[PDB]
Amino acid sequence: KQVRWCAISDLEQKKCNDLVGSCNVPDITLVCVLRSSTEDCMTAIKDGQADAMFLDSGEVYEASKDPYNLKPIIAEPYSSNRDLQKCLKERQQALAKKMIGHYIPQCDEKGNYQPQQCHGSTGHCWCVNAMGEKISGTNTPPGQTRATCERHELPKCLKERQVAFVPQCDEKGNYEPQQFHGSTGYSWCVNAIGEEIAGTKTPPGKIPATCQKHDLVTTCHYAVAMVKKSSAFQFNQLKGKRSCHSGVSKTDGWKALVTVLVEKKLLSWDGPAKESIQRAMSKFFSVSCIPGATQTNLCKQCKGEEGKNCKNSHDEPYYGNYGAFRCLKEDMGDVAFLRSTALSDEHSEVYELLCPDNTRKPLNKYKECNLGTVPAGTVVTRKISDKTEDINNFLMEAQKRQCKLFSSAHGKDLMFDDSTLQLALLSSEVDAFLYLGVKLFHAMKALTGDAHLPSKNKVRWCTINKLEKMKCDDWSAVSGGAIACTEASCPKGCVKQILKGEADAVKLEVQYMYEALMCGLLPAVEEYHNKDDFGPCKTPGSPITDFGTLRAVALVKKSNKDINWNNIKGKKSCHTGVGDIAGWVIPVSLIRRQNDNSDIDSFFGESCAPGSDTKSNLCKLCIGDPKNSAANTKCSLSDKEAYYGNQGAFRCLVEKGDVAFVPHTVVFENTDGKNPAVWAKNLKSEDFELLCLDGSRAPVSNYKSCKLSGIPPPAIVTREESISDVVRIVANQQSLYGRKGFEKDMFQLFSSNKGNNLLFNDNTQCLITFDRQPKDIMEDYFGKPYYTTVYGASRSAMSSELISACTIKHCSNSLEVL
């Protein structure tokens, strides 16, 4: 097997061939393909001439589009997970330097930093926090009483909980995004470290601002503007100056600067629709070196010879952060835009930093004087990912064998950023959007000029299969411009489309709502399913007696008078299926919050929960159908498991188990002769009962009171800015095509000939506008009992790539005392 790495320059080719000769990965052969620039390597990968390369984050979005169509696959984790056992990696890397007397970080058995660190060759010791950051002032020489280093095993929120406001924390001890004051009614949002965001203070009785989840990144890199102390201009006087940039497509040399110039209104630019960003920048600076730029004056200062001048390549001596520094040093520019990785103390004598507040500060003040944070780059390959396995196996084996991937005598930041500690395989789900995150993806999209201009009068409805797409096309065809259709492969894909600005609304079952609410989407309308009362549909806003929701109940046989909610442990159970809300989510959530987290084996006896491990206690009661009893078909999440679903779990209770976990309708749907099957033909609803949380039992008609939990209705989600419009247009369309629509003979919102339950559940009576209450949206939508039961009333109850991409990563301020 081969992995063709694409190099952009002679120096990168030399490092790549050094790795070819020195790094022995069995069964995988490294091959180096040479191109003249970053973009020519991207093209070679697109064409199948190379396999992988490393890209700046500022390039990921552009790389994901024509004419490249590349995706991130392998990268260093840009989150607080970069610090999980980081001591071990820094220890391996320091020992890899093979320098005599060099300081080697000391870790414990778990891989964490020892609170006291020592430089063995000098006898000096100091204290570090759990992140490996030096506590200020704790360095002592040998022979002197040492500073006492504290373990500080509790997080900041849990340590503030020791003090007696009341900062609600999650289970890991981190701050909750939403903070609510108990004495008053004011609620606000915090920033992972426990500091309030401006604009989130909401008085009681007002709709609270939805808080985004935050994650603290320890070691951050920043885009800075470096100048000489000999000059005297300020940031507001940049127009007409000569500049050196690391690269036209890099965040540390272009995109952060462009963002700041637009925000400060220093750059005359009418937007990407009227003028390219490069065109506007070429009239802002007079003669610059900006590798890759297509404006000639932005290449005049570059030093490369014929054919190499202004190339995105180390063949251009002014390319990259150190090349832009060389350009500034050799006086070919008045300012250099570069990443803070190229700052050093040796440069603090001659050079300083130009800050966007029109001041100048020392180099050590880069956290206080920068143009934004720079996320880590990433290895990319073709979207079709035919070589991802090979690239990953090669890189992981090379890291395990400690090959010199992240350093070279030929130069700095060749092939990879030298600051890379460890590369890890990304999930195949990760694309440019998930890698950059919501805000950054949108900013890159807007800078490129692909930003969708919103329409207040049209709703782009997202579909999850071809039949939904056909039904939506019908709807759009009779909608008079009010409805358009987009296509995705699953509800999460639609949620992503909405977050990216490619769609506007989608219906989501409860399973998907947590994620959706985590990412800042809100319910516009909800499916109303009460078939006995059309009032709230005919007269929108009229009072509601029952929304038609399903209630999750624990059904028993009345004869077995020994089953109570307290002695459920050990009894035989019946479930509709793993993942189902009434059949699985709510029962197991209640059990785990009342006993120890142990549903597999350590609670029930023999059960039949389809989809579980075939050789487990939760699969003994399951029986397949004798139509093909040769195959197992036991615990199959399908019709072949006779105990799968509502009728399945009821049959399980009938023939095997003691208690069934089902929606309240199952016993009524299957008893009283309403089921023509052989079983339940003589079954009565009065022959069963339901278990209550207080240990009591109640008749099957008491499901509204004696229930395990309520279940929220399916919700149509959209972005906040679209709520009104969506609520309006749906309403209009309902009055046309709902169950009593004026033109119901032309189209039906809640039925179709193309299939069943497309876009909405066919049993939907209508869609009712969500009435937002002055509370947290998680509680407001789920109901406080459901929220508290299945998510602990916490924003940290689930992890996913989407939730990560919706999590804001941010950096500290300056000092590291404690």
Ligand SMILES: NC(=O)OC[C@@H]1N=C(N)N2CCC(O)(O)[C@@]23N=C(N)N[C@@H]13
């Ligand atoms: N009729 C009814 O059942 O309420 C419908 C609507 N839908 C929810 N999922 N909710 C969560 C709890 C809740 O109060 O029932 C509600 N919260 C608001 N703001 N309106 C409700």
Ligand SMILES: C[As](C)(=O)[O-]
């Ligand atoms: C806690 As000690 C004496 O190993 O620094």
Ligand SMILES: C[As](C)(=O)[O-]
């Ligand atoms: C053994 As010592 C004085 O370097 O902690």
Ligand SMILES: C[As](C)(=O)[O-]
């Ligand atoms: C400025 As480019 C997308 O050709 O690297």
